Design a protein around this ligand. Sequence first.
Ligand SMILES: Cc1cc(C(=O)N2CCC3(CC2)CCN(C(=O)OCC(C)(C)C)[C@H]3C)cc2cn[nH]c12
Ligand SMILES: Cc1cc(C(=O)N2CCC3(CC2)CCN(C(=O)OCC(C)(C)C)[C@H]3C)cc2cn[nH]c12
Lengths: 728, 721
Amino acid sequence: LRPIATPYPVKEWLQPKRYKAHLMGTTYVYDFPELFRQASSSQWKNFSADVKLTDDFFISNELIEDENGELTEVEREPGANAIGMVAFKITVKTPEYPRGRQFVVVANDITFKIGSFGPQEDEFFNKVTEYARKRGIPRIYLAANSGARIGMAEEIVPLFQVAWNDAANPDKGFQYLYLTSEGMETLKKFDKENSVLTERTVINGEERFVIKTIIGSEDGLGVECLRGSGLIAGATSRAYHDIFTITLVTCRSVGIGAYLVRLGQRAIQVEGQPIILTGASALNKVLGREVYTSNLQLGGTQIMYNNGVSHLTAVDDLAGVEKIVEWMSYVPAKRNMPVPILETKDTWDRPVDFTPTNDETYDVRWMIEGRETESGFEYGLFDKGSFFETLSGWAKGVVVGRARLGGIPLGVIGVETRTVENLIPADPANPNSAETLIQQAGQVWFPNSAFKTAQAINDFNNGEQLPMMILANWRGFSGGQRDMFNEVLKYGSFIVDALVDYKQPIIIYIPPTGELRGGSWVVVDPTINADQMEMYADVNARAGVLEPEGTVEIKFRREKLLDTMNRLDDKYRELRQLADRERELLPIYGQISLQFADLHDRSSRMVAKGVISKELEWTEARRFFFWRLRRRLNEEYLIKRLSHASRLEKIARIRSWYPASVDHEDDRQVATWIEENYKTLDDKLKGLKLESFAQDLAKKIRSDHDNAIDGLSEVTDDKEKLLKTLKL
Amino acid sequence: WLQPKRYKAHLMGTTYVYDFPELFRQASSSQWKNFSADVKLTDDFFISNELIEDENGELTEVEREPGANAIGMVAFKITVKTPEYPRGRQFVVVANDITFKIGSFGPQEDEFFNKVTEYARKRGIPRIYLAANSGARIGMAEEIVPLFQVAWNDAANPDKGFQYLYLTSEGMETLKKFDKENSVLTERTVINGEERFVIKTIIGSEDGLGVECLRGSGLIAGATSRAYHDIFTITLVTCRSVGIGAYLVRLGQRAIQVEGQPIILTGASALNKVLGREVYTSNLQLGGTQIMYNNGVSHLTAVDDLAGVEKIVEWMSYVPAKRNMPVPILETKDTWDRPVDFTPTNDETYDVRWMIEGRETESGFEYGLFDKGSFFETLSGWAKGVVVGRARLGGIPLGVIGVETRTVENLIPADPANPNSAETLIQQAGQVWFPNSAFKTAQAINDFNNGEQLPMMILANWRGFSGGQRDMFNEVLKYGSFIVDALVDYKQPIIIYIPPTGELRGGSWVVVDPTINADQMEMYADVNARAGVLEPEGTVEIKFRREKLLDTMNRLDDKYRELRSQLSNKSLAPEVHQQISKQLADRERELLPIYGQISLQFADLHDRSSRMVAKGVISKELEWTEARRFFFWRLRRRLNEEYLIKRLSHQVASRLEKIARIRSWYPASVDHEDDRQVATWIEENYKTLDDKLKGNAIDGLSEVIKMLSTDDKEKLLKTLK
Ligand SMILES: Cc1cc(C(=O)N2CCC3(CC2)CCN(C(=O)OCC(C)(C)C)[C@H]3C)cc2cn[nH]c12
Ligand SMILES: Cc1cc(C(=O)N2CCC3(CC2)CCN(C(=O)OCC(C)(C)C)[C@H]3C)cc2cn[nH]c12
């Protein structure tokens, strides 16, 4: 016992595995449910400080496989795990789900064979993934491992003989490895003849069983571990398209461990915990130099957070768990459940305070979440304190995050107007290589920011199942040599793909001082996904194929300019010396042609051409979007229910059921009627599924009387109900 | 008659649109010559009909005077008799007319392109796009140019500025007279006793000026993204392709770029204006083949339009006539029944292409795994560490992925925009996946799967993914993950084969394991292949350390064992003990190199195809010389069984349940493991098999049972009782 004389029992002595995990710089697996309890308790404190919590607000039940290999909930002592992979089913009452929400936590046990993935860990991880997938519930993975388990046939280590070239001089080499009749008998005695494949030969009157292949009796030595790695990689790839998936890198995550972090997409990396393939030491041996001093140079946060593999960083395990729980607060309790409304003190009915201006620099985040000013807080478009930024360490030209709009959660994409700079590190492996600083102009999509945008669209869509708002403000894609060579076209195309796949309402809004040009409009137009997309443009927004400077250079040339000077200038007209007057007028007429061009680029032309749904005023956008989104979600939910027929037919069907006094165009009135008539519309449609099922059998019976009656006859507690109905 | 437009196109460096069907006729005629020189062709072998919208706006085939196109986008429906489809195959060719408003995309061109895309998609037929354009159509309200007035700050001094632009009552009356009041949005004000109609927005009476072109661009970008998942899509860049035109090339994925024809976003001139310097001299510095073929946007290059059309027609020869039709078998003189001649050796460097398609040698041709002359390499200008292409195996077409074992080097160009930037040469070791080669592998898997609908073989030979700083920073994990995604989505048979001298390690095995897609994937390893988590040096470092090395020396070395034995005496003088220990340690030092080698062999003996077979991770261990004969019948049998699974899917279930049912129909004497026997039986019985194939609720029951007759109720009561 160390230390002695502590006020309470030494938890690191009661379970020595807890100390082993601490020695490795991570939390003991069986202590992670407690960290979830703390983070969930903190959630309530930040939401409503006055709320009193009972210990039944949070429930953690370990999941283990029974005799049949089926997952079952158990209460047992920490550290009784016969495999290096553990799981817990968590049931929490949260501010967004006061009656409770569930999720699954899968985790490597770093104390069990250094958290290596053997066939049993892989098959358990897969079973847990499938369990969460069948239930539609989130899958949290706590990665603390050393990749696929490595082993050798230990029973062959004390038996194998060496066939020397010269037994007197071992440095002269060997020809093969073999077993003696004794070695073969040893294996037969222990039922391990199958551990090796041998070819019998006779050298100097003695039997030599030359070893042709070593198999081993123990499972988990090599390729079988690789098979299991492939299984769970495929399982995670699938899971991401199905349920909310997230990973916390709590200690190292190696090989398959690194691939799982990426395949689950959403990742939170604890500072100092690397995500690696081959380690630095091994890479030094292969390279034949001491190139790297740490694994952090390969997969630390300075690598994975900067390249977007890690969406967020955490100072420690609890901070990471807090970030998981916060990220989940925007996500439905389970697949296909409505987005979780969390109304705070910042309600919908207010103007937007912070407004950008054409001549002044701003941070988009002020437009999104508001800005703290000396005169007080200037509220933004979304709920105060609701912006949860992600992928914040990578491709800073685009700003992605979750936010709330009057309590409605959604994904948000905004454009960083300020110039962004990133440091490409100097690789110690190449001495010729030096560190490089790249500068990227604002309101231009580059390969990395185009990739980030597509990634964000995909991560809001899959698992999160969130609606989205893109505050579209791009001049286009970088058409320069470097960026074209660096495949900007491929990354831009991913955006279209991501939009085509989107299954929740999308709002494209060109904001005040914002613009969309030829190259950028193409990848965000609502005709890409007309079932879900809508575009709006602010009254102070701009859009055209080219910028005014370009549209004047091509369509308002010298001939037009001079014909204008003749129409509008007394001196020029009197004269038509003319070249001298032309020189005098060139600056101001240049401004006039630019204005003439700019007057085509307005939200009013956009409305007239039928390319946007409405032109909007920024200060009123919060009030407008709140009711538009509330309405759009309410209709979507009805469409999904009505799927139990084209969407175009379903929307025409739904919008017809509205009382005649309801103005279809009135979002608030439509959204209000749907929510008030929900229980009634739940009844009205179930009572028509039954009316159809009644007419279904009334067809089958009237066509095939005695044959259907015999079918009814063929098809305990259900029989009792059916008896009661006959009895009346 | 067409000579002016034909010359205009030639001046641009492209073929006149209405002359492209002829280029397809030539390329199709050449296909037959290369296949069978003695075959005589009639004019009915090739049919081109123009597609136009009817009264109902529906696409219809027509014969009309070429050059009669009222829009800058034209389409043709082609019906060709090819070596792989002698009775004929169909496809659609969409093309910009470079002579019609410089091939710009206006609302009408976009809506036509979309209608043609949808037409091909509904029919399952390939969509060929011939890109020759200048992107979205640019315009201004020309009727407002001679009407607008300037509201000066001081009419006597124009340089003092202006406040707005306006129309007079005259201007407003002119527009009213021509039915164009809607061309502008105005605000009425009175200045100096005269009406000023302040211009708030210019709309214009002419359609196709700006945002309505941009909407149409978005429509066709979405349409092409969808088309790629649905039908075979390919693009030939025949003149410049700009903006939406550049995006269309990428969104259709498969692209053949004619040399000197650039794929660009903003042109060099405009970029020079924005940058405020003469940075670039040509569009080719931005989107020429030296850019797009080197980065994989362009899969292939062509010296001219006919060469490009020839490459389209060749690529199509591996592709089904239409979606979900079986892969087109094209048996040539190189039949299945032969060994594989070219064999790699561990000590001699080789080009994988020799293993794939064979090698011409002084002693004669050394045949490879696939049919002689069938290897059609693609993405050959980018990420050269991986080799991708279409090939034929006894006439069966398939996608092939192989590993370039030789070190690859690529030149990153110096951007004229950054003077501080210099050209860089990157060197990548063979048998290692880097970001670009991982991306190329995933791209290839996706392109064989979507539209092409081909089976695939991966000649797996990777030590892993590059785990170094540069490649990790350059997101190798993201590109490696795309491989898993691409495999999960695959819908045709996959064969993973670790070839002779080949290997698969911890990082590389994870992304190709058949448990990723058990319905379609299978793994095999050559008898001279290797696989383990780590390479032998790695394994001994973790699992055959000092203590194990010393224990072996104690077992196998006389001197070491004798000395260790001497340390058991309890009467030894401490200085004698120290000398025995020193001698023991000296002996250990002498033996460490050779015992290290022993441990390496001990490790290597675990890494064999026989352990792989014993562990059940591969289906069979194979001999390279017999692989062609083996894979031909394996693939033929799988294509046959796949066909039966689909047919059964329609009549009725899991894949496990579906093959089990189908295989239960095979005669009992048929060995399910005998590929040739199963394929032979199936093909002899397609028609017989076709005959076999052709041959809350409780509340609902409660509602209907209630309406039954007394006699019916009695029977239903008895059953419950
Ligand atoms: C004909 C014509 C068009 C335009 C125009 O509409 N844009 C200019 C180009 C951009 C889109 C808007 C803005 C930067 N950009 C780009 O490719 O930048 C690459 C790096 C970043 C390398 C400079 C395009 C996305 C302006 C002018 C000025 N003179 N003549 C013009
Ligand atoms: C512990 C241990 C493991 C391994 C091992 O199994 N591999 C070595 C690493 C590689 C995979 C096989 C080969 C190159 N490689 C890589 O990341 O290379 C990056 C650049 C290209 C930058 C050198 C891995 C894909 C060998 C040794 C030798 N001593 N100790 C070892």
